[PDB]
Amino acid sequence: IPRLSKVNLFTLLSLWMELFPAQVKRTGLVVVKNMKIVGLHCSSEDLHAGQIALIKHGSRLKNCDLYFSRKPCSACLKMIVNAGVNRISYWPADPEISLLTSEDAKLDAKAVERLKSNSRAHVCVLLQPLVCYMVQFVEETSYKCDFIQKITKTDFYYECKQERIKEYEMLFLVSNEEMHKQILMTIGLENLCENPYFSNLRQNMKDLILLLATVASSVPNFKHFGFYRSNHNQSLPQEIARHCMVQARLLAYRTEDHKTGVGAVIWAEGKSRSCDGTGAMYFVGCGYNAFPVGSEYRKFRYIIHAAQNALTFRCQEIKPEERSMIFVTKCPCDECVPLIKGAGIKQIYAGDVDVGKKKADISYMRFGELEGVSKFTWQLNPS
Amino acid sequence: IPRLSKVNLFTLLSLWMELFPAQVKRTGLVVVKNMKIVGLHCSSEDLHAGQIALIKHGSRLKNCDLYFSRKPCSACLKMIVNAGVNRISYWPADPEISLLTSEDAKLDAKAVERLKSNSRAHVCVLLQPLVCYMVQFVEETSYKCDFIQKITKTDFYYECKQERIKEYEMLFLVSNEEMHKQILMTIGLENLCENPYFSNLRQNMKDLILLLATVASSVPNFKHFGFYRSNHNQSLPQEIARHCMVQARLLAYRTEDHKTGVGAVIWAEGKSRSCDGTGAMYFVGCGYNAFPVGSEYRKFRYIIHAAQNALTFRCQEIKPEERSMIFVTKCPCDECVPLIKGAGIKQIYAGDVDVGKKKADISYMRFGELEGVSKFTWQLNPS
Amino acid sequence: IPRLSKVNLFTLLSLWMELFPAQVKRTGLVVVKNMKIVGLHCSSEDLHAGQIALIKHGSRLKNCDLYFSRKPCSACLKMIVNAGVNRISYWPADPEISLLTSEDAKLDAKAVERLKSNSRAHVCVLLQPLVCYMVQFVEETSYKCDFIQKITKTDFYYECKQERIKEYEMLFLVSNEEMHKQILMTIGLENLCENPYFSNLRQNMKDLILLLATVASSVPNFKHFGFYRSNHNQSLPQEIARHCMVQARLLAYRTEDHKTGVGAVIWAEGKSRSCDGTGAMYFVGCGYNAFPVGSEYRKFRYIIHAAQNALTFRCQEIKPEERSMIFVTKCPCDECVPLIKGAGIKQIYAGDVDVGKKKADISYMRFGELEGVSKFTWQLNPS
Amino acid sequence: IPRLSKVNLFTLLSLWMELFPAQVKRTGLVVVKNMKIVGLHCSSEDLHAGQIALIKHGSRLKNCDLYFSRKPCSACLKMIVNAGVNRISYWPADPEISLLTSEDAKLDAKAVERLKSNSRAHVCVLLQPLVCYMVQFVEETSYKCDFIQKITKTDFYYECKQERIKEYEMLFLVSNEEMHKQILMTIGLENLCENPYFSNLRQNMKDLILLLATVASSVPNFKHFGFYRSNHNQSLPQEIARHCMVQARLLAYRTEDHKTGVGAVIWAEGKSRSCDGTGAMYFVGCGYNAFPVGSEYRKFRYIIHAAQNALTFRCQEIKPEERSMIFVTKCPCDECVPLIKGAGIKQIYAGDVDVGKKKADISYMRFGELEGVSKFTWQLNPS
Amino acid sequence: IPRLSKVNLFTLLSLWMELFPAQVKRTGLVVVKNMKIVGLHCSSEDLHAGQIALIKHGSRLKNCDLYFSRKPCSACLKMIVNAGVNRISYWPADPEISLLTSEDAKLDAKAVERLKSNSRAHVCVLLQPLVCYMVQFVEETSYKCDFIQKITKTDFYYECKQERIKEYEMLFLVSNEEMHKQILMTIGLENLCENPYFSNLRQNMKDLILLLATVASSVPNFKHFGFYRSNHNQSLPQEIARHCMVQARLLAYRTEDHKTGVGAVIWAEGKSRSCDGTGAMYFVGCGYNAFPVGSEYRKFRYIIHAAQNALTFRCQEIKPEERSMIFVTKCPCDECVPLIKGAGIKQIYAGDVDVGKKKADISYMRFGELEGVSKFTWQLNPS
Ligand SMILES: [Zn+2]
Ligand SMILES: [Zn+2]
Ligand SMILES: [Zn+2]
Ligand SMILES: [Zn+2]
Ligand SMILES: [Zn+2]
Ligand SMILES: [Zn+2]
Ligand SMILES: [Zn+2]
Ligand SMILES: [Zn+2]
Ligand SMILES: [Zn+2]
Ligand SMILES: [Zn+2]
């Protein structure tokens, strides 16, 4: 099966983080340390994505790969290169200081280039072309996901997917070819301004947005479907729950071991005010189905599930007093439910498609009779 | 004087952690990083020792030596090797999935062997033969310990020692040679099934259990003896206090310099629910008398006391809101009492034998007149 | 412009930490890791500076540069070298155990020498001579600082300067050459007892005390001037606020190339008891105006402000429930105010000379319109 | 079987290197890098052992453990601590500048002590007590060695051992307790001047000399026995061949889990002048019959032979123009002969006791018809 | 005493290497690894300095600081950064492709700037201002050097110094204000084109050429003075001997703390053809008087002499077949002569001013009767 690239996932997550529900445009950000995500940020109405990462992490940004969805401003670049970041990737579309307006915006882009030159920071573009079968694979698996299939049991997917394609291309892409060349010249990408490198970057940029609109439509806003109980115990806002579930869906395409991909993400809600664009919520960990590191490949009994990787490679600890949520694309197995409950995760969001089913090596019986953790599943509103 | 080996102490502590007061058998665990204990776990009624370590530590298990008291199951082994552990030692007896019953257990043991070979971490047995004088030295010092000597002032020790020997032999040892050979064949120790490598392992396994029963009897349940106030402020359960004190007694035999060994262990009680087999309690730090690292050797003004090493080489911080207590085998000196009080440790458990004594380079006067820290000492129940 | 030496600042801060408001004398301490300050400690009436560092840091003292204001005692030296400190600088004045009295004091100093020889850590003296222009540069800038200039708007600075010169000479210096030679022979600096290496050390010691009394007088006690609100929300004690502001003033002289030096320090106040000599307050971070690490380069557009450096290279995290204070020598700019507010810093202490100004590349308009953060500025008491 | 310690072997080899045939006494030296010998030196009539190592290695002494047979003088110590050596072990009998005479010698020892104090090099004594069965094991295995058995088939061994004991103890040991007491006071070993540490060190020193005289006598100068060919190509001098064979015989006691021990050493003869005390010859590599660096568990099929270890962990390369010879205690097997011939080793010195024998997992048939390499075997002089 | 800076000495040596006797201009180069010189190169008539370093070192240029005397061309820069060099310092007077002529030269400079921008290696200028007493100190000591004093005992020094000042400033400096201003604009040094940074760089550049002309005149071509034998034996060409002696004379000012600074350099002559600008002659090692590294500090007894540092920190080995010679400013002591003779150095060049003298802790008696090593001393031609 096709496997999503690491730099393509961190780029896709950065674009998705820009769409977190809430002259200078919004910017998402992914902070990656040792090829593991250690933070997902968004630009609040007060601060920037590159400045929130400095507040949240500080000197811990040393030797970190930062993936912005817009080129960071001069103020936001000097602070992160001083922190110690070694790689700053960005989406080659309109930067943070909107060039589609100004003298200040155009002059600021020049300052970034001078700052990029005399500094050792690898401010570059890590965007990569996808595999030919990747876009077909994502569309095929999205229609079979636990969320589209749940609605089917109640044509709509393609209709909703087209709207996301329109919405995510007037936001993450410069439709005009002449406008994009101006931006690429202004942000120090002259070698990418000439064909076929201009068309290669543009095609791949459109290629990744199609994948994002395909994944984002797999957890759709449609006919009042959301995450609700089957009976803290309070549900998240539906916009946040769907956004965090798409993050798990994106991680599900990093799966390497099984033909069916599972991805999980852990989010916790602070009890105090926060400077991030996500609000009180912050990112705890993420993971996907994979073999143990080192190629440790009965074939399913040597895999680390999505929930287990999230609890293993987590940056922030689970605060007992806080409300911490986990978003698993599928029903947690009998192996992961004790770990999720044991780790102190208060709420579980998943798709109750495999619930109650016993297989040869995996079982989904503990999820249904789980006590102590609130389980929200994709379904119609009981009210 | 004989000095306990590092791998022998981590093996003994793992066996002792299995006896923490509270198909698949209980397992103790010692997580060691940079030759320093950074966690003492036990198998809860819900989770496993290997899975609890993943929850408590996560990715911090990287480059860690884990000492189980039973061979971890395939589920627990795949997670810890994924986290990045370095050396998975285990007690070469009945594994976690009990072989003394089943087809599922035998298949699971095979699954570990395939995972052991595919993976990189060294799943080995670090059990070592004891020094010839070690067992005699341990018995000699245990009769002169601050707890047995306190009892005599108010023949019994050997009577209690024999009972522990019987109890710990039917638990940590396979008495039947036929049964043990089946286990060693099943758990991949084929080259330890033939003599003299079969009697060597069996003798050493029995040799360490004799040492454990000797140390465990030095803090005995006898004539309603426990840790009570000499007159939070609430005492720990007597089973927990004695268990944590034997941990300090085990560390006291790593004392390299001074003729009398003192060991200390710090435990803290969380205010929330926990997934560990020890309950709300968790391990903060441990230490013993030793010269400053790097062989920095009066001969007593260059020694780092047991309390000071525990405060120095501690994994978890002392939470001011939590109830944290320290178990020191001997009365804390006038040098360690301010450090224990200053660090925020709420309770002190020790043997008030040296209390009030004024030696040349060491004094025990500040312990008696200590304000702000609850002091529990080995004595009769006042009520 | 003159730039303060890295080891001269850590030496000056250690002397200043000894003056934190509250047989054995007080001792200040600076813990430096990777050339960044990770702790500022004083000596409480119960504990020592070298023992408080062990409590606050523990094993985190590994590979740390410790700058004491007095030579640590044998008890304090053995604990820090056990932790893993590599370099222990000290002020070559009277040590912690006062030699200006005793047989116990003189024997303890000899014990340190054996410990210093036996151990590996570099117990040395890093005091360095100042630049010729440095001493009058500090005096010139101090008279033009935001605090002396504020008073003049309401011939006095030199009277304060002389008083602190007298106060800091009878405290940090041994005026008698006979007494100092005895101390230097006792504390193992026998090669510094002979000229010209005896007058060189004494001259350097006098130059730093002259510089310290110059900086300390820049935030004077003249009249009723203090840090009051420009109408938690409660002000710090005036002695603490002035002391913490002088720390920022000392950091302001590490400014890389900018003509005007700005320094910031962040302090937080815990709600529980503490063992430190500073009380409940602990040190969060420090910084100064400087270009991004790696010598990055309109010239002001590529500089990291004092507040931004403090937020980046901070050891402790900003606890939302605690009281956090930042002391910036100049008025925070429009770049730093969102970061200080975003980071959760509850109170701002700063000057108000530049408030309301609109320069070309910098503005000070958001400070006046700041909501949610208490602002304290150098002014007379409104009451 | 008793396995010789690393620091005991490097100490034993340093003593043996002092006996290389050729006010200030001759000194042997072993240079160890990554626990592998990278040089064997002796004090020439012109230079010192510590100065020859600097010439032969230079900056390569960085992070190396040097094992002298006498405490290096001030000139030798300052040059090797400059190079960057890690540990400088020595035999605590009599330093290079002999104290059994002078004011200059006594003054120099004090200079070494001051140089040790202010430097970070671990100038220590790594001498360790032997295992109880070690001395008996060496004695019994020496009568069954390939060289004593050869003479037997043509009571003498004990007679040769006794005279070696007299010679080696008179040279490597200070017989007078008072005289040795003075030396340990002079060379900064006061803590070893008090019983039982004075008797422990003295007993351990005699234990290693007894072992050395046992190993040295195993390749005895009895009658006209030596290493002769079986009718370059010229034989080494018999004193050199016997000395180098004992080196290969001392390595034989590092054997890992194999009842019969095999050790190898490779020496090459330079075509030009040399500053070493060994003459034109230099040390190429050493190795003992042992398992791979990890574990390899028919059990003989996974053990690395002595010749293979020497060719693997060799410091100097085999120059085709030079005359290089290898000394192996046992006859090279059919597996090692192609490697020795292939590596370019010109001459082989061995014991032809098990030559021509074909065992199950090992054969010795290729040695008899080895073409291109001159084979010298322990035998009586043909003429 | 003033001490020459590291980056300030490697700059001086690079300029001096340009003057090695033999459109595009000759360029000297210093390759520095771990703050130790590992190569001195000059631009041959067929190759460039940056290309000879690649041939001589290859991949060993990784993590090396290269100090060119002219900015390397685009061809030379791309290969050295491909090798993995760390810093490329240069003398900001005129690049390799001379700008004082062309369109090709001006275009080439732009290519270097683009190459430096998108690459990672620090192409910077490490030139530093001299200490105030430095220039006077060198002028005073040079008149008292072994070579000026030798001629004096046979006013001239100042006359030769002025000629070197006239020659070296015409070559290493751009006298015209406008021409140097244009070059700094062309080579991407616009930040140094504005006062006072234009006058600062020009003044410091003049200070070093004055320093170089002062040192280069300390070994003058006055009358028929040269290095001739006191009583291979063949001497070097007088131009080469004087040039190599000035290298030693330059390192004499790197001496840690001695009024009598001593510097040494070792050179060897290959028997075959070479691509370097120095011919078959290549650089072996260099050194100066200094205390042992590691804070080491009868003061002269703990000083590693210039010859000893040269042998310790040599890069190339002393090949017996080649002709290798050492240049020491002072007469080798009785301690360094055995090491120079032992290391295999064939010839010694020195100043026989203090030959035969016997001080307290140093003697110069062994140099007079040194057999086996050819000795050449500064004297009049015996013909
Ligand atoms: Zn921005
Ligand atoms: Zn699962
Ligand atoms: Zn388990
Ligand atoms: Zn104590
Ligand atoms: Zn102290
Ligand atoms: Zn600012
Ligand atoms: Zn010597
Ligand atoms: Zn063999
Ligand atoms: Zn070139
Ligand atoms: Zn010398």
Residue numbers in the entry:
A (entry chain B), B (entry chain A), C (entry chain C), D (entry chain F), E (entry chain D): 30 to 51, 84 to 162, 167 to 219, 226 to 302, 310 to 375, 391 to 476
Task: Give the article text.
The C-terminal deaminase domain (CTD) of CDADC1 contains a potentially active HAE motif, but its N-terminal domain (NTD) appears to be naturally inactivated due to the mutation of the proton shuttle glutamate (the HAG motif instead of HAE), suggesting noncatalytic function.
CDADC1 apo hexamers are less tight than trimers, with a contact area per protomer of ~270 Å2. Each protomer from one trimer interacts with two protomers from the other trimer. The blob is likely derived from the partially structured 1–28 region.
